[PDB]
Each structure stands twice: as C-alpha cells, then as structure tokens.
Design a protein around this ligand. Structure first.
Ligand SMILES: CCCCCCCCCCCCO[C@@H]1O[C@H](CO)[C@@H](O[C@H]2O[C@H](CO)[C@@H](O)[C@H](O)[C@H]2O)[C@H](O)[C@H]1O
Ligand SMILES: CCCCCCCCCCCCO[C@@H]1O[C@H](CO)[C@@H](O[C@H]2O[C@H](CO)[C@@H](O)[C@H](O)[C@H]2O)[C@H](O)[C@H]1O
Lengths: 240, 179, 49
C-alpha cells in the first residue's frame, strides 16, 4: 500500500511538471489520462500471465511512468507545434502529426523493450524477481504504444485548442509567461554552449573516457548482495 | 549459490547487443547506433555515485533501477539523433548545423520528460515507513542515474553524433544540400 | 514488405541476426536426448505375502 501511495504521488508530481512546461490544462490532461489507462491495462496483463502484485511488479508500475509519458507527450507536442507552425484545427493537425510519428512510436518502443526483454530470461530462484519486473515494464511499454495509437490521437483531436500563427506566446500570463522567456535565451545560452563544444571534440572525448574508467572503478568498489533486509515490525530472539 | 548464480554480465551483454541491432534497424545504419549507445555510461556513473554516497549495494533494486535509467537515457538520446539525421536527409542541412537545430528543438521536451520522472521517483527516495528500505534503494539509483544521464548527455549526445559521422565517412557531403 | 526491405537492407539483416542469436542462445540451454518422451506412462503396484 505504501508503494501504491508513492505511485499515486508520482502521477500527481508528473502532472505538475506536465503543467509547468505545457501550460495548457487540456494538453497536460492528455498524458495524465494515458498513464492510468496503460498502468491498469498492465495489471490486466499481469493477470493474464499469472503474475502477482508484489514489490517488483509495483516498482515496475512506478518506473514505467517515464516511458509512458514520453509516448503521450510526443503526440501532444507534435500536434501542438503543428498547429503552432501552420494553422490547422486540432482534428487534421493530429492526423498529419500521427501520420509521421506512429512508425517512430512503434519503432522506438521495440528498441527500448530490447533493454528489458533479455532479462526476462534469468534462471533459477533469483530469476522470477527480474522476470516480473521486466514483463511489467515491457507490458506497460506495449500498452503505451497501443494507447498512443488509439486514445491519445482521439484526445488531441477533441481536447486540444486550435492555435494558428507561428505561436508560442510570451505575454498574457504572469509567472508562467516569465518562465518561457527565461528558457528562451536559456536555450540559446545552451545552443552556443554546444557550438563551442563542437569546435572542441578533442579533449571533450578524453573527459568521456575518464567518466568511463571512473565508472568501472566505482563499479567494482561497490559490494554486491541480493535483497535488502526490511524492518517488518517484528523479530525473534533465540535462547539456547 | 553453487547452483550457478552469476548471469548478469552475459545478459547485459546480450541486451547491449540487441539494443545496437535494433538501433541499426531504426536508423538504417551500422555506425549511427553508436552515437546513441555511448550515452549508457553517462547514466551508469550517476547510479554508482548515488548508491556509493548513500552506502547502498549492487543488488536487485540496483540492477532494475539502472535499466530503467538506461531505457530513458536511450530514449532521450534517440530523439536528438532522430532529429539530426532527419534534418540531414529530409531538409538536407549540413552536419554540425543540423545537429544544432536538431539538438534542442528537443531540449524542452527532454527536460519535460526527465525532470517529471526525477520528481516522480522522489516519493521513493524520501520514503520512510514500511518497505521504505526497498523504496529508498530503488529510488536513489534511478534518481542519481537519471540526473547525471540527462545533464551529461545533453552536452555529449551532440558530440557523439558528429564524431561518429566523421569516422564513418561519405566524403561528398557535409555543407548544405537541398532535394 | 519485399519492397520495404529492398530499400532497407540492414533492417532485414538485423531481423535475421536477432533470430540467429535467439537460436544460438537456445542451443546452449536445450536438453539433448535420443527421443522425446514417447513411451506411454506406467505405474506398478508391488505387494508381498
Ligand atoms: C493509476 C491506477 C493504477 C494504480 C492503482 C493500483 C493499486 C494496486 C494496489 C492494490 C493492492 C491489492 O489490494 C486488493 O485490494 C482490494 C480492494 O480492497 C481487495 O478487495 C477486497 O475488497 C473489495 C471491496 O473493497 C472486494 O471487491 C473484494 O472481494 C475483497 O477481496 C483485495 O483483496 C486486495 O488484495
Ligand atoms: C543495455 C544496457 C545495459 C548495460 C548495463 C551494463 C552495466 C552492468 C549492470 C550491473 C552489473 C550486474 O551486477 C551483477 O549482479 C549479479 C546478480 O545479482 C551479482 O551476482 C551476485 O549477486 C548475489 C549476491 O552476491 C548472489 O545471489 C549471486 O550469486 C552473486 O553472484 C554480481 O555480483 C554483479 O556483478
């Protein structure tokens, strides 16, 4: 239940960061809706596979959220800045937009499931632990693509407001209009940061190989174990 | 544990291999996937550092957490390169210059994605109470990994692309096509 | 689909490769026997007087 509580909080915190960037309430409600459709579906898949609701499947639910949100945003944002760079109503704006990303969507999910699918195949007693986490994430990612092809286009086609005019608007709100304006030349102060580290290449490469050796160093130093002790609110004392 | 209990390496190696192959399919190139895959240590370093500084262990909750980070760090890097390649092929723009346009036509979506996830695993890291041991564990690995994975990649993914594209030739472009 | 992969020769290669390593890995863990189970199952009751 405590993991259920952080799962809920995770959703609300994702919603809040949705709203901070995408200022429109209906635009952030779309990814927000996608998340519980995909996660509840995932429970329905777990059932189909005879899995259980446990620490690893619950953690899968929480950790899937980043992956799911991306599918929803890629559709919303593409539709947004199709309207925000031509002048189509949300219904044809999403149709065009879906027309050019749905391949990518399906495609990228397959690439990404590959980072989880192999680990569905651990062996022995340790094995079921990672299998149940891996199938959860991959189940989620699959349904995420499903929802992105079915519900999300529908919601963009019916819940998004039209725009037209090469728009992303600086002046009509208070706090949020400020946020945009900072990020704007924050984006350029970032762009030439890259442009300066492109005429570089030489020793920016060397730094990367330091991160890599520092990585393999930090790795072997770290002890290993299976599962941590938890405070279960009870214990035993032996007398011999 | 005499019952052969150490399979992680070969499994991570298989997983790494299938990722490269899948990426090859996505970009229709053997070399370009490398510019996506070099992002992997950038996320691993964060997890190791975070687990180190909070005295955690390399356990189950450390391994599932890092695949999560690698998954999303991959996804960030992929849509950078996706733009850079499509600006060079559809728009026909030059190497360095299509990187730049590509580079953060996607920053704002990448900072959405990452920061929303990072603040989302935050209930795990600050979790006290029943089972918080597992929540604390799985949480600080992902958070530290994602924090480094994205701040670092956003400067290194631009580099990864251009360095790979030069070592793996095509000496009759760069500079400004159209078609 | 043939037209699709005529244009995308490495994608066709990775499908072939992914199939192949899945197969290689399968060989490492597959049991070996002359036969599968083909005998009908028997149960014997033994008693003594
Ligand atoms: C964003 C949406 C997805 C997130 C939501 C997921 C939450 C998952 C945590 C649920 C843990 C399972 O907890 C489960 O709860 C239900 C509801 O009390 C219980 O169900 C029990 O009460 C309900 C009525 O309240 C009865 O219909 C049922 O006969 C009885 O068994 C299950 O016996 C229990 O095992
Ligand atoms: C596609 C991108 C993926 C690239 C990721 C590459 C980085 C490597 C990821 C982490 C490495 C795996 O970490 C590895 O975990 C296994 C499995 O529990 C540990 O194995 C150990 O764990 C426990 C506790 O001792 C025992 O049950 C087991 O018998 C023992 O061998 C190893 O000590 C460790 O080396």
């Amino acid at each position: 239940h405590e993991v259920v509580k952080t799962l809920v909080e995770a959703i609300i915190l994702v919603f809040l960061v949705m709203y901070l960037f995408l200022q429109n309430f209906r635009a952030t409600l779309i990814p927000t809706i996608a998340v519980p459709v995909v996660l509840l579906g995932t429970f329905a898949v777990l059932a189909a596979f005879g899995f259980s609701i446990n620490t690893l499947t619950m953690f899968g639910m929480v950790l899937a959220i980043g992956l799911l949100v991306d599918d929803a945003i890629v559709v919303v944002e593409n539709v947004e800045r199709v309207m925000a760079e031509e002048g189509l109503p949300p219904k044809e704006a999403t149709r065009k937009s879906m027309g050019q990303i749905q391949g990518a969507l399906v495609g990228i999910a397959m690439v990404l499931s590959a980072v989880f699918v192999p680990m569905a195949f651990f062996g022995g007693s340790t094995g079921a632990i990672y299998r149940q986490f891996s199938i959860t994430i991959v189940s989620a990612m699959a349904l995420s693509v499903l929802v992105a092809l079915i519900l999300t286009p529908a919601l963009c086609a019916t819940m998004l407001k039209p725009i037209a005019k090469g728009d992303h608007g600086e002046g009509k709100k208070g706090f949020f209009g400020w946020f945009n304006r900072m990020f704007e030349k924050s984006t350029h102060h970032y762009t030439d940061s890259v442009g300066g580290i492109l005429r570089s290449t030489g020793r920016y490469l060397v730094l990367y190989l330091i991160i890599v050796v520092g990585m393999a160093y930090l790795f072997v130093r770290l002890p290993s174990s299976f599962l941590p002790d938890e405070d279960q609110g009870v214990f035993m004392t032996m007398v011999q | 544990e005499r019952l052969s209990g150490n399979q992680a390496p070969s499994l991570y190696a298989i997983s790494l291999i299938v990722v490269f192959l899948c990426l090859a399919a996505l970009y229709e190139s053997w070399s370009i996937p490398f510019s996506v895959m070099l992002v992997v240590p950038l996320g691993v370093i964060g997890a190791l550092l975070a687990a180190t500084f909070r005295g955690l262990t390399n356990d189950v909750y450390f391994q599932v957490g890092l695949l999560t980070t690698i998954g999303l760090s991959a996804k960030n890097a992929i849509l950078i390169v996706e733009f850079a390649k499509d600006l060079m092929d559809k728009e026909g723009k030059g190497l360095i210059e299509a990187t730049l346009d590509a580079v953060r036509m996607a920053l704002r979506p990448i900072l959405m994605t990452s920061l929303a996830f990072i603040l989302g695993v935050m209930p795990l890291v600050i979790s006290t109470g029943a089972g918080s041991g597992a929540q604390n564990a799985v949480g600080t690995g992902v958070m530290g990994g994602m924090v480094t994975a994205t701040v670092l990649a956003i400067f290194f993914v631009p580099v990864f692309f251009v360095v790979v594209r030069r070592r793996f030739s095509r000496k009759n472009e760069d500079i400004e096509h159209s078609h | 689909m043939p037209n699709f992969f005529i244009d995308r020769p490495i994608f066709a290669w990775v499908i072939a490769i992914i199939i192949m390593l899945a197969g290689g890995l399968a060989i490492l863990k597959l049991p070996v026997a002359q036969y599968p189970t083909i005998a009908p199952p028997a149960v014997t009751i033994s008693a003594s007087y």
